[PDB]
Amino acid sequence: TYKYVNLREPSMDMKSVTDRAAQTLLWTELIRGLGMTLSYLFREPATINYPFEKGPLSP
């Protein structure tokens, strides 16, 4: 069916090169990766304590 995993050179000239260099010079995407867990911290966890609460089952 074909889907292709390779990007085949995202940077070409001037504008497309600098932003691909900016993420490697400092971080940016690591700070963006930091934000993924940041919002994940605030949302309520699905946890069941066994001696009081019980997990889902079936007939």
């Binding site: 504008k15 600098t18 932003d19 900016a22 940016t28």
Partner: protein
């Protein structure tokens, strides 16, 4: 009457949709804030060191003024 498991698709959950997109930062605009904070950083800092000079000369003047010491 026969009752079995019914079929339901409705929205089809959208087969393979991209969620990753460029947000906040553009490229050239981040350097204007980045280097812009640096130029604002030095100008604010060096003015305090010039105000430190007002204290500095006045501190060493106390030693010259004190000769009975």
């Amino acid at each position: 009457x026969x009752x079995x498991x019914x079929x339901x698709x409705x929205x089809x959950x959208x087969x393979x949709x991209x969620x990753x997109x460029x947000x906040x930062x553009x490229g050239y605009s981040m350097f204007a804030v980045g280097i812009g904070a640096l130029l604002f950083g030095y100008w604010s800092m060096m003015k305090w060191n010039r105000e430190r000079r007002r204290l500095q000369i006045e501190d060493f003047e106390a030693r010259i003024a004190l000769m009975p010491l």
